[PDB]
A paper describes a structure:
Mucin 16 (MUC16) overexpression is linked with cancer progression, metastasis, and therapy resistance in high grade serous ovarian cancer and other malignancies. A humanized, high affinity antibody targeting the proximal ectodomain represents a potential therapeutic agent against MUC16 with lower antigenic potential and restricted human tissue expression.
The scFv, [VH-linker (GGGGS)5-VL], was secreted into the culture media under the control of the signal peptide located at the N-terminal and then, purified as pure homogeneous monomers using Ni-affinity and SEC. Structural analysis demonstrated that all six CDR regions are composed of 5 flexible loop-like coils, a short-helix (α1), and canonical disulfide bonds at the C22-C96 of VH and C23-C94 of VL that are formed to improve the correct folding and thermo-stability. The overall architecture of the scFv is ∼ 37 Å tall and ∼ 46 Å wide between the tips of neighboring loops. The C-terminal of VH is connected to the repeated Gly-Ser linker loop and following VL begins from D149 residue. Our crystal structure also revealed that the straight distance from the C-terminal of VH to N-terminal of VL was ∼ 32.0 Å, corresponding to a distance of approximately 13 amino acids (∼ 2.7 Å per aa). It is worth noting that the number of amino acids constituting the linker region between VH-VL must be more than 13 residues to prevent an inactive or aggregated form due to the insecure space for interaction between VH-VL. The VH-VL complex are likely relatively independent of each other, and associate only through the interface. A buried solvent-accessible area of 926 Å2 (calculated by PDBePISA v1.52) capable of forming hydrogen bonds, an energetically cation- π interaction (∼ 5.6 Å distance) between cationic sidechain (R44 at VH), and an aromatic sidechain (F251 at VL) may improve overall stability between VH-VL. In contrast, the scFv in complex with ligand MUC16ecto showed only one melting point at each pH value. These findings imply that the apo scFv (VH-VL) has a higher independence at even pH 4.4 and unfolding of the scFv can be inhibited depending on the MUC16ecto ligand.
Numbering used by the authors: 149 to 384
């Protein structure tokens, strides 16, 4: 039951300055069996899905400019940008996978002046209703990756809700959706579904399917490809 805090919540700087953002974990994230700090960092610009910046506290994701680096171990972590740029405006979140899957509250950074996951099926419903968001996968071997649904509630916070394993043998839910939501996958047609029942206003969010990444040296404990996000609005 790990709580991550981030600081500062918000700051504005000028192009080219260095910034450091911190992430403090209420409990150590260094896993002694695996040798790794199960902590990742995401950048989310407005109107887009999160993008994986760093995992294992310090390993930069492929394709990320090297002005981004991650540091720290145990309970205190840091993301720094050496010479920030205009395209670096976004909210930055840290994310631990030591116990379940939980995100920090985010740091909003302002500047003072063929893998595809296409989603479908959001919309409006009233409390008690049901909806089914879905995720079509293309451009990679769907049946090798575990897949996850995480949402962005209006209040700026990301929240993991469900995970299904690569072959579909193992299924995990957040307590906040357990018994109401049902995740499923079909590895024959490369699709992922979230069947949502007994919807409540707290369920209103942008909903993202996302691929649990892994490499030749182990799972990232992070998600490297996200769909575009479909809105779910619980009514009245």
């Amino acid at each position: 039951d790990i709580e991550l805090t981030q600081s500062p919540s918000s700051l504005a700087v000028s192009a080219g300055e260095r910034v450091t953002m911190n992430c403090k974990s209420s409990q150590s994230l260094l896993n002694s069996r695996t040798r790794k700090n199960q902590l990742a960092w995401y950048q989310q610009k407005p109107g887009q899905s999160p993008e994986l910046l760093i995992y294992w506290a310090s390993t930069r994701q492929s394709g990320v400019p090297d002005r981004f680096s991650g540091s720290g171990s145990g309970t205190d972590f840091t993301l720094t940008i050496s010479s920030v740029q205009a395209e670096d405006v976004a909210v930055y979140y840290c994310q631990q996978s030591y116990n379940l899957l939980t995100f920090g509250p985010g740091t909003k950074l302002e500047i003072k002046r063929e893998v595809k996951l296409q989603e479908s099926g959001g919309g409006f419903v009233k409390p008690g209703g049901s909806l089914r968001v879905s995720c079509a996968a293309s451009g990679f071997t769907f049946s090798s990756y575990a897949m996850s649904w995480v949402r962005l509630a209006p209040e700026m916070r990301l929240e993991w809700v469900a995970t299904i394993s690569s072959a579909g043998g193992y299924i995990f839910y957040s307590d906040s959706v357990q018994g109401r939501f049902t995740i499923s996958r079909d590895n024959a047609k490369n699709s992922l579904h979230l069947q949502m029942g007994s919807l409540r206003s707290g369920d209103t969010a942008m909903y993202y399917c996302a691929r649990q990444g892994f490499g030749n040296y182990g799972d990232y404990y992070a998600m490297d490809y996200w769909g575009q996000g479909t809105t779910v609005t619980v009514s009245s």
